[PDB]
Every structure is written in C-alpha cells, then in structure tokens.
Amino acid sequence: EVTQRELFEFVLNDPLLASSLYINIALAGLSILLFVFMTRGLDDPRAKLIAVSTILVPVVSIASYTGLASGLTISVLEMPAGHFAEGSSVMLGGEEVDGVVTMWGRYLTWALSTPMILLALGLLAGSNATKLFTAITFDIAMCVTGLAAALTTSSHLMRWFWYAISCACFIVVLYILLVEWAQDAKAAGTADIFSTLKLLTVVMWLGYPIVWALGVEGVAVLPVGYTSWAYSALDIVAKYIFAFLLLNYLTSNEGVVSG
Amino acid sequence: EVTQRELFEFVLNDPLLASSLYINIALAGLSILLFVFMTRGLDDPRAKLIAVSTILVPVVSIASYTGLASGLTISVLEMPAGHFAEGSSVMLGGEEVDGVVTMWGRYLTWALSTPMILLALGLLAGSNATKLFTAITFDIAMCVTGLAAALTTSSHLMRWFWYAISCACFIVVLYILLVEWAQDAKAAGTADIFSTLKLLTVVMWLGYPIVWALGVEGVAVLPVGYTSWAYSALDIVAKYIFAFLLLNYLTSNEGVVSG
Amino acid sequence: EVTQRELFEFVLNDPLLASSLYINIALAGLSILLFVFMTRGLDDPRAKLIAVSTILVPVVSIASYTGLASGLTISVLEMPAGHFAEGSSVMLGGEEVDGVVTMWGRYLTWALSTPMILLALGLLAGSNATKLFTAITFDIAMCVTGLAAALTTSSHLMRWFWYAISCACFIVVLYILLVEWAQDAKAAGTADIFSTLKLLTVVMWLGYPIVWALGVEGVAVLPVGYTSWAYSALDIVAKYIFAFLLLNYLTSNEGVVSGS
Ligand SMILES: *C/C=C(C)/C=C/C=C(C)/C=C/C1=C(C)CCCC1(C)C
Ligand SMILES: *C/C=C(C)/C=C/C=C(C)/C=C/C1=C(C)CCCC1(C)C
Ligand SMILES: *C/C=C(C)/C=C/C=C(C)/C=C/C1=C(C)CCCC1(C)C
Numbered sequence: 001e002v003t004q005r006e007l008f009e010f011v012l013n014d015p016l017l018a019s020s021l022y023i024n025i026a027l028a029g030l031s032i033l034l035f036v037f038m039t040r041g042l043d044d045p046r047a048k049l050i051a052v053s054t055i056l057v058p059v060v061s062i063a064s065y066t067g068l069a070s071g072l073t074i075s076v077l078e079m080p081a082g083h084f085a086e087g088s089s090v091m092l093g094g095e096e097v098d099g100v101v102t103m104w105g106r107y108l109t110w111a112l113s114t115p116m117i118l119l120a121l122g123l124l125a126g127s128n129a130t131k132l133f134t135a136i137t138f139d140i141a142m143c144v145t146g147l148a149a150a151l152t153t154s155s156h157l158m159r160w161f162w163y164a165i166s167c168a169c170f171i172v173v174l175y176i177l178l179v180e181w182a183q184d185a186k187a188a189g190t191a192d193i194f195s196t197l198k199l200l201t202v203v204m205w206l207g208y209p210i211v212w213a214l215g216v217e218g219v220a221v222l223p224v225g226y227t228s229w230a231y232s233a234l235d236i237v238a239k240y241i242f243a244f245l246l247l248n249y250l251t252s253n254e255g256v257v258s259g
Numbered sequence: 260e261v262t263q264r265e266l267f268e269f270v271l272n273d274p275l276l277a278s279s280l281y282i283n284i285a286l287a288g289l290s291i292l293l294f295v296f297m298t299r300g301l302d303d304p305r306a307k308l309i310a311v312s313t314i315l316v317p318v319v320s321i322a323s324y325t326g327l328a329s330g331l332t333i334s335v336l337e338m339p340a341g342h343f344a345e346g347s348s349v350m351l352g353g354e355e356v357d358g359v360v361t362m363w364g365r366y367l368t369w370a371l372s373t374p375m376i377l378l379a380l381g382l383l384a385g386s387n388a389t390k391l392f393t394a395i396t397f398d399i400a401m402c403v404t405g406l407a408a409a410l411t412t413s414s415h416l417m418r419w420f421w422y423a424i425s426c427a428c429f430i431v432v433l434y435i436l437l438v439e440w441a442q443d444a445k446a447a448g449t450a451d452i453f454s455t456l457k458l459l460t461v462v463m464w465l466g467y468p469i470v471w472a473l474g475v476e477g478v479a480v481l482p483v484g485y486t487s488w489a490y491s492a493l494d495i496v497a498k499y500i501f502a503f504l505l506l507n508y509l510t511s512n513e514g515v516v517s518g
Numbered sequence: 519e520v521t522q523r524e525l526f527e528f529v530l531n532d533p534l535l536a537s538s539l540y541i542n543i544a545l546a547g548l549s550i551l552l553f554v555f556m557t558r559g560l561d562d563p564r565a566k567l568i569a570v571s572t573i574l575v576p577v578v579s580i581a582s583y584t585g586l587a588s589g590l591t592i593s594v595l596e597m598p599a600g601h602f603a604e605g606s607s608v609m610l611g612g613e614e615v616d617g618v619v620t621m622w623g624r625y626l627t628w629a630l631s632t633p634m635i636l637l638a639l640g641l642l643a644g645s646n647a648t649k650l651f652t653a654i655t656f657d658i659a660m661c662v663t664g665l666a667a668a669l670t671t672s673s674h675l676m677r678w679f680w681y682a683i684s685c686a687c688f689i690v691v692l693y694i695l696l697v698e699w700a701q702d703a704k705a706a707g708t709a710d711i712f713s714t715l716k717l718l719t720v721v722m723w724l725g726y727p728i729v730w731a732l733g734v735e736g737v738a739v740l741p742v743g744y745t746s747w748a749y750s751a752l753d754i755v756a757k758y759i760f761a762f763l764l765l766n767y768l769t770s771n772e773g774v775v776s777g778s
Contacts, residue, residue, distance in 0.1 A: 005339065008413035049389040056396055063404055063424060070417040072410060080523065130567040137574055145581050151590060154526030158588040165581060264598065267672030304648040311652045315659075322663055322683065329676040331666060 006092035007071030010101065016225025020232040021069040028062040031240045038247050044258040046123070047250055053119040054246050057239050060116070064109035073105025082156040084220040100216050101224050106231060107147035111140050113239070118173070120246060121197060124257060125181035126188025135176045142169035150217050163218075167209065177202055189256055193249045197242060204238035265351040266330035269360070275484030279491040280328040287321035290499045297506050303517040305382070309509055312378040313502050319375065320498055323368035332364020341415045344479035359475040360483045365490060366406035372498070373398050377432070379505060380456060383516060384440040385447025394435045401428035405468075409476050418476075426468065436461060448515050452508040456501060463497035524611035525589030528619065534743030538750045539587040546580035549758045556765050562776040564641070568768055571637040572761045578634065579757055582627035591623020600674035603738035618734045619742045622668050624749060629661035631757070636691070638764060639715060642775060643699035644706025653694040660687035668735050677735075685727060695720060707774055711767045715760065722756035 011018050032055065039051040067073040078099040079086040089096045115136045122132040149162035177198055185194035208231065212218055215227030222230070250257065270276050291314060298310040326332035337358040338345040348355045374395045381391045408421030436457055444453035467490070471477055474486030481489070509516060529535050550573060557569045585591035596617040597604040607614045633654045640650045667680035695716050703712035729752065730736055733745030740748070768775065 004411070004413040008417075045387050045389040049392060052389065052393050052396070056400075059397075059400060059428075063400070063407065066417070066421065066424070067407060070407075070411050070421075071413045072407060128563050130563040130570065133567065134570045137570075138577075141574075141577060141581070148581065148585055148588075148590060152522070152588045154522040154589045158526075158584065158590075161584060162581075162588075165584070169577070262672075263670070264672040267676070304646050308648045308651060311648070311655070315655055318656075318659060318687075322659070322666070325676065325680060325683070326666060329670050329680075330672045331670050 002076050002092055002097060004071045007074045007076075007101075008069075010090070010092050011069060011071065011074070014225060016223070017228055018069075020225070020228040021065050024232050024235060025062055025065045025069060027236065027240060028058045028065065031058040031243065032062075035243060035247055038251060041251055042254055044254050046259050047254040047257055050120055050123050050250055050257060051247060053116045053123070054243050054250075056116045057113050057120075057243055060109055060113040061235060061239060064105060064113070067109070068103055068105040073103070073108065075102045075104060076100065077102045077151070077153050080153055080156045080159070083159070084218075085216045088216075088220075100220075102150055102217070103224075103228070104147055104150050107143060107150055110146075111143040114139050114143060117201065117239070117242065121177070121181060121194070121201065124188070124190050124197070124246070125185035125194050126190070127176075127181055127184050131176055131180055131184070135173050138169040138172040142166045142173065145169065146212070163209075163213075170205075170209070173205075174202060190253075193246070193253075197246055200237070200242055200245070204234055204242075207234050261335045261351060261356060263330040266333045266335070266360075267328070269349070269351050270328055270330065270333070273484055275482075276487055277328075279484070279487040280324050283491050283494060284321055284324045284328060286495065286499055287317040287324065290317040290502065291321065294502060294506055297510055300510065301513055303513050305518055306509060306513045306516050309379050309382050309516060310506060312375050312382070313505055313509075315375045316372050316379075316498050316502055319368055319372035320494060323364060323372070326368070327362055327364040332362070332367065334361050334363060335359065336361045336410070336412050339412055339415045339418070342418070342479075343477070344475050345415075347475070347479075359479070361409055361476065362483075362487065363406060363409050366402060366409055370399050370402040370406070373402060376460070376498070376501070379502075380436070380453070380460065381440060383447075383449055383456070383505065383509075384444040384453050385449065386440055386443050390435055390439050390443075394432055397428045397431040401425050401432065404428065405471070409471075422468075422471075429464075429468070433461060433464075449508075449512075452505070452512075456505060459496065459501055459504075463493050463501075466493050520594045520610055520615055522589040525592045525594075525619075526587070528608070528610050529587055529589065529592075532743060535746050536587075538743065538747040539583055542750050542753060543580055543583045543587065545754060545758055546576045546583060549576040549761065550580070553761060553765055556769055560769065560772060562772055564777045565768060565772040565775050568638050568641050568775060569765060571634050571641070572764055572768075574634045575631050575638075575757050575761055578627055578631035579753065582623060582631070585623045585627070586621050591621070591626060593620050593622060594618070595620045595669070595671050598671055598674040598677070601677075601738075602736075603734050606734075606738075618738075620668055620735070621742075621746060622665060625661060625665035625668055629658050629665070632657050632661060635719065635757070635760070639695070639712065639719065640699060642706070642708050642715070642764070642768075643703040643712045644708065644775075644777070645699055645702050649694055649698050649702070653691055656687045656690040660684045660691065663687065664730070667730075681727075681730070688723075688727065692720060692723075706777075708771075711764075711771075715764055718760055718763070719756065722752055722760070725752045725756075 011021065035055045042048045042051060076090055076097055076099040085100045088100050089098060090101055118135045118139055119132065122135060145162050145166040149159050149166065152159045152162060181194065182198060185191040211227050211230040214222040216224055270280060294314045301307050301310055335349055335356055335358040344359050347359050348357055349360055350356065377394045377398055378391065381394060404421050404425040408418050408425060411417045411421055440453065441457060444450045470486055470489040474481045475483055529539060553573045553576065560566045560569055594608055594610060594615055594617045603618050606618050607616055608619050636653050636657055637650065640653060663680050663684035667677050667684060670677050670680060700713065700716060703709050729745060729748045733740045734742050
C-alpha cells in the first residue's frame, strides 16, 4: 500500500534523483519564456505553425517532470523472476517494500512531445502528409510499447519482446529522418538547417533505448539516479537546445519556410 | 479500497449530486437527438464539418456523465498536508472513509469535448490551421494538467502548481478567442454569431477554474454536491445551449460558412 | 490482490485462451512482414497513405495481443447484481478469486486500429475530409464506450446503457460505409473493390457486439476462452485477411487511387 506521498518523499532524500527532476522543471520553464519572445516577430502562419509545435515540446516536459517529481507518475513494481532487479527493495521511508521505482511517467509523455518534434522537422523539410502521418504514428507506437515494456511485471521475456517491437517502430522514424525528409528538405530549401537538427535528433534519441536497457528497467546496472540524469541530460539536448536552433533559424528565415 | 458500486451508491442517496449528473445525461442525450434533427438538411461539406464537431460535444458529454454517475470515473482521494480539506471523510453507506470525492471524470473528458467546441468555433470564424492547432493543443494541455492537479495528493503546493500551468495554457486559448478569431470572424462574415458565442464561451469557461478553486479540490468552501451543480450548470450553457445557438445559426446560414 | 503474473499464468495452463492470444501475436507479425514486402514498389503518396494506414492495423494488433497475453491489459472484475456472470469465481493462481476474467485490452486498442481500417477504406472510396472525420470520431467513441461498458461493475443497467450508446455510435459508422462511401467509390473509380471490402468489413464488425453480448461481458452464455477465440477469429478476417485483400488490389491499381 504505497502512497503518492511516500514516492514524493522518496524522490527527496535522494539528491541524485531529486535534482535531475526539479532541474528540468526549471530549465523547461525558462526555455518556454525564451522561445515565446524569440518568435514574437513571426507573421507567416506556416512559419508560426512550426514555432508552436516546437514550443510545445518544452511545455509537455515541465508537465512530465512535474508529474514525476510529484510522485503522480511513479510506481513501485515487483519485477518478474529471472529479471536482474527482481528481489529488490526500496523502502519509501521506514518500511521497505518489495519492488523497484518505476518512472513510467517519462515513457508516457514521450508519446506527446516526440510527435511534436517530428511535426516540426517534417514541416521544416517540406514533407507531404503521408510522410508526416507515417513518422508520427510509428513514433507514438514506439513510446507506448516502451511504456508497456516498463509496466509488464508478469514475465521477463514479454518485457524484452515489447522492447523489440518498440525498436522496430523506431527504425521507421529513423528512416524518414535520414532518408525521406533529408531529400524533401532540398526542394523546400532548408537542407542546411535540416541537416543540423536531423543529425542532432538521431544521435540523441538513439541514446534513450540504451539507458533503458542499462537502468533498473533492463539489466539493472545503472542506478535510478544516474539513469534519470542520463535522460534528463538527453532531454536537455534532444529538446531545449534542439528547440533553440530551430527557432533561431525560423526567425532568421521566415521567408524560406513560409507558404 | 472504495468500490465502484459504492461511489455509484454514493451518487444516488445524495439528491443534489444525483440530479446534477442524471439530468445532464438526459439533456445531452436530448441535445444530440435535437441537433441531428436540426441539421438533417445540411448539404455543404464544410457546414457539415462544423455540425459534426458540434454534435460531438454533447456526445462526449453524455459519455462523461455516465462515467461519473456509474462511479467509473470518480474516486475518493486523501488531500496532502495543509490542504483545506485534509482530514475530511466521505461515508459510503454505513462506512466512513477518509478523503474527498474526486470527480476526475470531468477533467479527463473535457480533453475531448473542449477541443471540439474550439474546432467548431474556429471553423465558424474562418480560422487558418495554425490558430486551430494552437487553440486546440494548449486547450488539451490545460485539461490534462487540471486533471494532474486533481489527482496529485503528495503535496498541497504541487496541486496549485499544476493549476497554475493549466491557467497559463488557458490564457493562450482566451487570447486566440478574444483577439485572433474575433477578427477572422469579420473577414468570414460570421462576426455576429461569433461574438455571441465568443462571449458565451469566455464567460462560462472562466467559471470552471473558479468552481474548481472553491470546491473540495481547492479551498473547499463548497460541498461536492454544490460544485457538481455548478459544473453541470456551466455545461448546460457552455455546451448544450452553445451548441443549439451555433447550429441554429448554421442551419440558416449554410451558404455563408460554405466559403 | 490479483497479480499480473497470476493473470499471465491463468492464460497459460488454459490451452484455448493461450492459443487464442499467442496465435495472433504470430499472425499479426507475419502480416506486417508480408504487407511491407507487398508494398515495396508503391510510389504515389496517396497510394502509400492507404498502405501505411492498412499496415498499422496489424501493428496495433501485435501490441494488443502482447498486452493480453502478458496480463498487462487483463483484469478480474466482479459483475453487478443481476448479471448472469455475477457470483463467478475465476480460480486464479492458487486461490479461488471472485469475478470474471475481463480482457479490456481488446476494447482499448480497437480505438486505435479501427480508425486505421476506416482511413484506408474512406481514402479508397475517395471520401472528403468531413465524412472521414465523422466515421473516425464516432468509431473511436464506439470503442471507448465499449471499453467503459466492460469496465463498469457498479450497475448491470449501466453496462447495457454504455453498450447502447456504443451501438448508436456504430450505426453512424455503418451508415457512412453502406450509404455515403458506397456512392463516393463510384466517383473514385473503386466501386467494386470498395464494395467488396465494405461488405467484408460490415459483416465481420457486426460479429463483435454479438460476441460481447454472448460472452462473459454480456449474458455470459460463452466462457472466457470461447469469447476470446471468437474475437481472435474475427480479428483474423476483419484485420489480417482484410488488409491482405486491400493491399493486393492497391499494389495492382496504384494509378486508380494515385490522386493527391
Ligand atoms: C524528449 C524525449 C525524447 C526525444 C525521447 C525519445 C525516446 C526514444 C527514442 C525511446 C525509445 C525506446 C526504445 C526504442 C525501445 C524500448 C524502450 C524505449 C521506450 C526507451
Ligand atoms: C464542456 C466543458 C468545458 C467547456 C470545460 C471547460 C474547462 C475549463 C476552462 C477548465 C479550466 C481549469 C483551469 C484554467 C485551472 C485548473 C483547473 C481547471 C481544469 C478547472
Ligand atoms: C480489429 C477490431 C475490430 C474490427 C473491432 C470492431 C469492434 C466493433 C465493431 C465493436 C462494437 C461494439 C458495439 C456496437 C457495442 C458495445 C460493445 C462493442 C464495443 C463490442
């Protein structure tokens, strides 16, 4: 009978875990303020659509980190036999319970933010509807199956099967990034900036599945505090710095992506 | 371990509460039928897009009220330390239980119905995609964070922090409603009706965050039965008569909204 | 009290229920490969929109069945007084638990795969955006209220009230398929194929509320293992062979639907 209150207090007392969360709550917030003033000059509906979806990324993030820091989107799950973290304890204060600290809150919200990054890139590269639809739907599938992976406590194999299904959807997104939109950006006349964000996106995302396999959800070698900082670190680049570069361009070349 | 049947029984047994839910199950159902009958004459696809988006509002409403009356989307939660309602008890049948009655089913479904209200209004006003995308996304972020606020029981401050994020998202919606679409409507030849609905929408929508703050979830000065009728009252205007007025216009001005 | 593992092991140790779930994880996966391979030569963006839409059906499906076999989207629920399955025991794990085995994960994912079946068909029929929006939102409403019906345990009358609402949403979808799109396909030059898939779709989809009614969720004349196999048999036709047939035509008539 673990309460939200114990999880909140649990996030505290553990400076490694606590800092990684609250730090982003503020970084996301400040990021929004900056982006709003940076795009005040835009007047082109198509140029402003690109900015709105870019700005929504940090918006989903503060909510995501707040949900986590609060204990709303965190849970104690008893891993299945054969699992490395199986047999673990946590102790939410004075009473220690069986299981591990599951921060499914991240996986859930990714289904919201990532489609937004993609919407941004896709529009920058003058993508057509079919390609946007394809990237976004498989991207969402990737996130939701990952969340199902983390919540599966009945069998060790099922958990990894989920992981596999998520990787397969990932390749579809990677494929449109590297191959499809890369070509479309040329006709749109944004291959320059597109190449930049594209290179950024792929590298950064590629790291999320890795941290997962290492952290308690997977092999369980990395501590929850480090895995959290890893993601927290990845989000900082995969989202905020990514948002700045894109917006910085949009304001300088509103005529390019106009129409 | 409160049961669903217990919350269902708790709704009945309480005249104020019972009537606020069951009356709207009937009004929304009657609204749907009336609205379908009123628009059976439309021919223009665009006019028809507006009519369906509008009819979906009471469709989501009847589902939402059934989810609450049946107890499926209600829960009894204990408020964090210092909350004005911490220490309250509810009493189900012959047993007394700690906590407050949280009708989170409303916050959740608003995420589906309010986007539809906005869809119909935006289109009626001749909005472009970028503004629709903006009103709608932040409208959803508003509803979702409001839900998070009602579901957060770990900290009193976290709750009001969720509420603040939600208010920020709300101003965005109000902005495009009061400024953006007010102008587009003139250009689309629908300023007369928009003005009536924009005024109705803004005044009514303002009432929800007030009701939330005054009820058990906030400073708890109003009983659960009172707060429920306040919302039901708002929905009757913000949803049903708002849809009647819009469809009555629509059915007499099919040509103007055609384009 | 009822753990996921107990549910995951209840499925296993019950040949019927297990096979009804694992066989479709396999069929769904084999369908994706086959469909991907079949659609390699497509080039027209609109033709490829219909293809990706169709392929997502079996993608949603493999994940769905994994969630049911893993026990992640299964629950034991107690039926309301008056329910023909009230007072039932599932005999979960070692103890005998009250209630019935509810596979709500099916209803949850339908809200994601059925809209894709509809996008493909609407597109194939050359439907405008208004009819597509109408069919899809009411389809989702139908799925969601069906899920709520199964998840409601407070009142027997409330369960059938959800069921009725959901049915009302269903007629909207059926009307768009049988009346609207049937005419639109004649203009899009896909009259025969759409009429064929329209009939396959209408016949199989009607099977669902019938199964729901006859199974544990309904009047309970069909045990859980049998209700599960009936759903799985319906999925094989309404999803996999349905997609197979649609893509078979598509890959031979890309020009007809090439449009924009
Ligand atoms: C702001 C967050 C971003 C950009 C997150 C990206 C996340 C991914 C690319 C996650 C991928 C995963 C897999 C491919 C396998 C299973 C587990 C996941 C969810 C970690
Ligand atoms: C049919 C329902 C309608 C029109 C609901 C409207 C709801 C709002 C405008 C809610 C706003 C809220 C805030 C601004 C602050 C936090 C709490 C909420 C969710 C009550
Ligand atoms: C891949 C799954 C398919 C094609 C599922 C189709 C499901 C339906 C047509 C369900 C309809 C239902 C009703 C009309 C009433 C209530 C219960 C349902 C959800 C079974």
